Design a protein around this ligand. Sequence first.
Ligand SMILES: O=C(O)[C@@H]1O[C@@H](O[C@H]2[C@H](O)[C@@H](NS(=O)(=O)O)[C@@H](O[C@H]3[C@H](O)[C@@H](OS(=O)(=O)O)[C@H](O[C@H]4[C@H](O)[C@@H](NS(=O)(=O)O)[C@@H](O[C@H]5[C@H](O)[C@@H](OS(=O)(=O)O)[C@H](O)O[C@H]5C(=O)O)O[C@@H]4COS(=O)(=O)O)O[C@H]3C(=O)O)O[C@@H]2COS(=O)(=O)O)[C@H](OS(=O)(=O)O)[C@@H](O)[C@@H]1O
Ligand SMILES: O=C(O)c1cccnc1
Length: 329
Amino acid sequence: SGPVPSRARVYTDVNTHRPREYWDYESHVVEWGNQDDYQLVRKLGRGKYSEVFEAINITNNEKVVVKILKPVKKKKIKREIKILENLRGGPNIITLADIVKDPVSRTPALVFEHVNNTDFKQLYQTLTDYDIRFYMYEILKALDYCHSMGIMHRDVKPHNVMIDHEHRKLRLIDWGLAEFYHPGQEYNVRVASRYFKGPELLVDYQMYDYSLDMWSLGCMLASMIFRKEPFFHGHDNYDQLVRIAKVLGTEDLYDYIDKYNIELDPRFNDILGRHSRKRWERFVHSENQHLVSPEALDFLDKLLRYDHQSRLTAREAMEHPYFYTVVKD
Ligand SMILES: O=C(O)[C@@H]1O[C@@H](O[C@H]2[C@H](O)[C@@H](NS(=O)(=O)O)[C@@H](O[C@H]3[C@H](O)[C@@H](OS(=O)(=O)O)[C@H](O[C@H]4[C@H](O)[C@@H](NS(=O)(=O)O)[C@@H](O[C@H]5[C@H](O)[C@@H](OS(=O)(=O)O)[C@H](O)O[C@H]5C(=O)O)O[C@@H]4COS(=O)(=O)O)O[C@H]3C(=O)O)O[C@@H]2COS(=O)(=O)O)[C@H](OS(=O)(=O)O)[C@@H](O)[C@@H]1O
Ligand SMILES: O=C(O)c1cccnc1
């Protein structure tokens, strides 16, 4: 009767072995810093849930970024704080330096280590082959770390990667959609940005895991090596699945639906069509061919798979031959 369950194949039980305090973010007691330490310099942007400012720590003259959380569903604030505290110090994870109560909004303001207000979307269509491999490896360090800590990011996309290209440093940011992975839990499918949403989300399969982030990463990789922004260019969440099926084929999609006993939304019957998988060479052309190698195509092929259980994990991805040419350390 209805969809059958799924588990992560790695890091399945990390939260079950933790003290309740690790993952029970609703019970977390925020420790507050001194709002007087920070002076706002200029507004950088405004999300659905926050406003972000360049700021200065007056106590040491060091630049920081301040993210003032909007009203929001209040539970989501403690979730982001606890995740950021749990991950602090991990490889390529943005560092939460402080949490203060903003005097004007009267809401929490997260103070982050300074990063150059340059996100990966500004650079990722201009990198050399070597730099694509280098920065993909850096992103994978962050994803394996958070997955190993029981956390899925759920919003991997170029705007959530901050890059200091002069210093060859990268940080994975915006943990406001991240969640703790609990085996057998059903999650909200209204996560990730349209072009980066995994098939599990698009077919309304709720028992997903860390492997969602590996699909999103694959969408970023495909966009970079093929110079196609985005790779899967859906006009809405339904057409998004059709765009995927035009590349990966409908037979493997129906096999995925069949395996997890998913009831596909009947609105797909008139739009999905019948498609065969395309060989990845179809996307290679004179402008992108210097970014494509057998290793890049084999790696991408193992990320962009309908069945979330079949995708490479972050650690398996770091083992791939695509990264043999990247200098380690
Ligand atoms: O100039 C640019 O830089 C732009 O870059 C790319 O767009 C990025 C946005 O700039 C960025 N905005 S943010 O202010 O920095 O955060 C961010 O967009 C996300 C925002 O939340 C929002 O974008 S907005 O322009 O600020 O309005 C938009 O949110 C969508 C949700 O994704 C969508 N969720 S769903 O799962 O598809 O259903 C839905 O939310 C509705 C839903 O019912 C409920 O939300 S929930 O959280 O899923 O539960 C809730 O009820 O709210 C609903 C709602 O608000 O409508 O729709 C909203 C609204 O979207 S829309 O109607 O304006 O289309 O998209 C978010 C997102 O992550 O996409 O990030 C994007 C992407 O960054 S990137 O992938 O790195 O590029 C764009 O460039 S490109 O994508 O064309 O290549 C472009 O907009 C621009 O070029
Ligand atoms: O995590 C965030 O939302 C963030 C972190 C650093 C810079 N800007 C945003």
